[model samples]
Target: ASAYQRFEPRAYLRNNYAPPRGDLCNPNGVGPWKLRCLAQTFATGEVSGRTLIDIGSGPTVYQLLSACSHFEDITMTDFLEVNRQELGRWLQEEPGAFNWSMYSQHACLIEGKGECWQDKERQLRARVKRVLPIDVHQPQPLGAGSPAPLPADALVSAFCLEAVSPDLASFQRALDHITTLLRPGGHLLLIGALEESWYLAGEARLTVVPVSEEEVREALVRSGYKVRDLRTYIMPAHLQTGVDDVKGVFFAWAQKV
Candidate 1:
């Protein structure tokens, strides 16, 4: 918790999603690639559902930019209070909060929903019913009798499982734990760092489990999830940026079996 306590939301966002790293124009860039993958996945219409839960959303909204349009009720969660507070700031449209307009516009155009970017942000802000705390290690991630919704029809997690777990086993167990929150046949759109041991967020140097693409597939199958689509993005040398040694990233569309 101490490591996460040192996290600086704005700096973390700038480091990963700001300039050279988050160039939305660059199709091969990690940020644009993730957004494209999610947009494409949602475009397929296979990930349809009512209630959608975002697990371990650490001061970020880009992960849900495309998904917000589909779900009726959206719940965003995180383990860190600071992250939660940051999300709340945006949810309430408070000034000084991080701006996700670029993400909103990017997702809107890519999905080709014939909607304006302002509507995209407004839609997400309105659809989000709650911003609650979450701990993925527990069997009931949002805890028993979660007020938002239980047995959610779909789950979206980004850089959550491996970023928090100390080892691969713990990562898989955490995966299983969160799986209990999704109903059978529900979908999981998971994105995460690959082969990354650590990352810097202000004073924090948090540990990562450095999971491989194959290991992720195995874990998903073991957890009774049928992989729908799994895409990998190799980080370009110039875009490495030194904040983390994240060699690549994986975006998986898994359906509960």
Candidate 2:
């Protein structure tokens, strides 16, 4: 059976999607590093796009918090309904929802926008248009029941394809499946583990398809993308206290050719 076959959304959140003060959001943390890298990528100039899609957004919104200022229309997705519901809980400001203020603050600092975290959060909430379910394994990732939005001008994904796919082939296939949601010449921002085999989701172990820098570049090229920028962050020993055996993380900016 696939490792994600028994995937539990709550457990995954509790273990991986920690609050802003948690390890995942600390300045030296892996999660913040990825977010900061992406923040820097968009910091150079004004982001021009009609729509932005976050493929496999999981139960987190920090990844796109910085983008809220640049893009007016934002859509997030997850493979599991539970994950989508979790995102909605936060989006709707329901009780027991995850606190993302720290993420907003961190993003604010990275954006050099002073301590206006509240405004950032509010902007993100207002910008998020939908939280839809997506299954990358299928040709139509959103399935037949979900409403199909217009092709996005940009797509941001973090720790999704490799974690959901059982192997490299499926990872590539999932990449192709997601690209269909992007318009020609659209932008793609990706973040994923490097040389990671598996990770813990509460007590359940989930598998990851370990990949190298060369492989990532080749995969993007084969998928008809032109790699624009790529950066890597090594995991600090203190941060590697056993959530996963990831040696490092990678952030890449590509454009559909």
Candidate 3:
């Protein structure tokens, strides 16, 4: 159930990112694999006019970047300090493996700005106020808190549910928190691994239990969410050494009913 912490972040991107840059703004990990996943989420019209809250959001701001094109606003949440710092840096400098030119061209919203991600990155920064030092498991104060502010309409969780919860029940509770944060009709999009082996990650190891499509559906229903859509895809990622291999991640779309 536990994997090496070293396998995360770097490996997390490799295991998850596919091709074609998934979503336009907020594709977490880069490459063709991430592109396809972005497309999968886009096909769901649940984004427009909605506020998106990313649960257990990692270093990748691709989803937030992509959603910014349509959603009214986007908020990212995480439990780790290092990831939050790295993500903060990413918000300032939009540099990644993908060529900015290509992303700007195909990513509808990025057009018109023309060459270089300079203007785009600044705009993204303006739109996104980093919710630093916020943990998915923590309760907040009404006026002031660690992250300072938390605002959202819907919740989008990618490769995060399994990381914090020790078991299925805990996962459900976390999912419920997402619902509690949103008003009725809010949406949730979850993506994660099927059978990931335990890997090394620095001093601490991470254990992610594989979750089935059926389990996700049942969990959503039990957690006060109505099934909106669901799908599965295989995504291969590279190790720190950059060796490539594929992993399965499930994407689920549900609305708070």
Candidate 4:
């Protein structure tokens, strides 16, 4: 059976489609307990003067922002056209793009929106040098062979891979595409829901596959990645609001070996 694609047509077709959700960009962003845990795991090694690409970069591109201070440049992508357009619009019009206002000396949200990291660079106030529209399920404009964005230092696929592929083999193909983009000793970051189903996009629910830590590690190793760090984050009940319990996210940080 062929795996169905999600977030692509809706992003392009839906006229009223809003930007996707993600953590607001902050040096001390809130509600990123999982990302905080993942960051600790990424501390096992260090990367400098490199570019990190965030696959499935939704409307709220917080994690990518979190990494801006660490990398020279960052690339973000998503299957949805609307999401990209909205992100571009937000990047252009959103407040703090030019200057970040500090509500207090100690704390400030991105544009004071309250969601940490949504401003993409409100915390660091760095401009997104580039954006690539990529889809994990199909052969994207930049496929697994060409080095258009060759030697990628880091590839972050959060809530993207599983949402695109239905099974392990298909998932591996997506990883293989990522491998082509990475150079030897590059880092690969995977984060998404563990046991989940199709998601609701207002019109309907799109199919989303459930993934586990063991399976993620096995896929990375088989796809020529050196498993550096693997960690699972358990969200609090109060914090878990707006998301289902079956959908817990984890991180798999690997290096291209």
Candidate 5:
């Protein structure tokens, strides 16, 4: 029932992030809420490490903007090759890459990074060393056939597991799969939709396993993570925008136990 094969980045970006959702300037918007959450979490100087792996980055780089400074090496992965190519376009500074300067600018503003959005973009590209294919359903998400080594110092996953899983069991299993890639005591920065059953991307409508904040907490603990902080953001009616039935977003900072 998953139509991820038909996923088109252009239409996906438009449907999920157009207009109000893309308004990074608004402190109250979903875009800024995400950036602020990560920025504040990183600003605490706690989640730093040499290698930071991003699990299922989709077509967005904003999730890593605030994190670029804290890690020496960054690895980005996606279940779709098209998504990897889309990410590579921006990392290579190719023409027609979806512009992320606004995201970088907002992140810089929030983190007090001297406001040089250009440099932030450059730094991100430099630190992002590899973009690999990932199937979270597998026992080894990155695979033995990969470039970067196993057991990353940190893992950041946004809208990946529950969005891709067929059900709750699959979701937790996928979480366990990725957890193997994070070393003990390593931090896990997670963000995902709350109570979303499905969402659109071009002609493809993919299913998502609805999960609540309570369930997410339990899932982490079951997956062998020590929950440090977890926060939720309710979608004000105007920002809902009908892309999906997502009630809200949840952010979790958990450490491997």
Candidate 6:
């Protein structure tokens, strides 16, 4: 099976989005803090566009929770069918879905909304138009015949290219491929792991092309994006479990030029 085929949505969710202390939802966790920072960026007029497309969206919606209010239309994409199905379960509000109330509360606190999470959850579901398959290996990442909105006003991706790409060259190629889907001068928000390598998803250990902040900036420039803002969050030693030796997480907001 291909590396991506080894991806199990439930395992991925459990590792990154599970309750109590999932990295993406916990108040003191790396995922929520990073997403909260991104929310601040959105609050500060850093992200602007009518349509937002989340490239390589996994089972988590934490990344998009903050941006949903800013975009009228939202779309999500995943390379694996399981991941796509997982997202569908959440969108449909099915039972046994991964809980995102913690994520919503974290985001609300960041924005100081203090509103009920259900309101935010409903808003996100209403804005999401569709979830489709995307293969960054292809020039047209959405496949040859899949029909969906093209040239989104903004694009957001989190830990996708690196986890799926076997090497730096493929990572850059995938970056360039997705750049085509963003309108010229449109916003691009990227969240990824930095340094170290490899992450466990389900029973599979996926390869991550160790990318430095410098390399990330270079890749974005080569892909026709001008970096406007970049930030990093170091993982506390206490939180580093064997699941992945991720040294840190990086967030970058750029504009396609």
Q: lDDT per residue, candidate 1, 119-144, as tens digits?
A: 98888899999999989888777887
In candidate 1, the residue pairs with backbone N, CA or C atoms under 3 Å apart (3 or more residues apart, or in different chains) clash, namely none
Give TM per candidate: 0.97, 0.92, 0.71, 0.73, 0.98, 0.94
Quote the RMSD, in angstroms, for model 6.
1.7
Which of candidates 4 and 5 is the stronger one according to lDDT?
5
By lDDT, highest first, what's the ranking? Answer: 5, 1, 6, 2, 4, 3
lDDT for each of the candidates?
0.90, 0.81, 0.56, 0.58, 0.90, 0.85
Best-fitting candidate, measured by lDDT?
5
Off by over 4 Å in 3: 1-34, 43-45, 94-122, 138-151, 197-203, 235-247
RMSD of 4: 6.4
TM-score of 1: 0.97
Where is model 6 more than 4 Å wrong at Cα? Answer: 19-28
Please state every model's RMSD to the true fold in angstroms. Answer: 1.0, 2.2, 5.5, 6.4, 1.0, 1.7
lDDT string for model 3 (86-142, tens) is 676666564543323344344433333343555544555666765544444444411
Residue 93, candidate 5: C-alpha displacement in angstroms: 1.0
Question: What are the clashing pairs of model 6?
Answer: none
Residue by residue across 1-257, what tens digits does model 2's lDDT show? 25555666676666665633255445777667876887888886534587899999878888898777778889899877777888899999999788877678778878886849888888899999888878888888877756546688889998899888878998899999998888888889989888898887765688899998778888998899999988888877776656679888888899998
For model 2, give the 10-residue run with minimal summed lDDT: 17-26
Is candidate 5 or 6 superior in lDDT? 5
lDDT of 3: 0.56
Once model 5 is optimally superposed onto the true structure by TM-score, how far is the C-alpha of residue 45 displaced, in angstroms?
A: 0.9
> Which prediction has more favorable lDDT, 1 or 6?
1
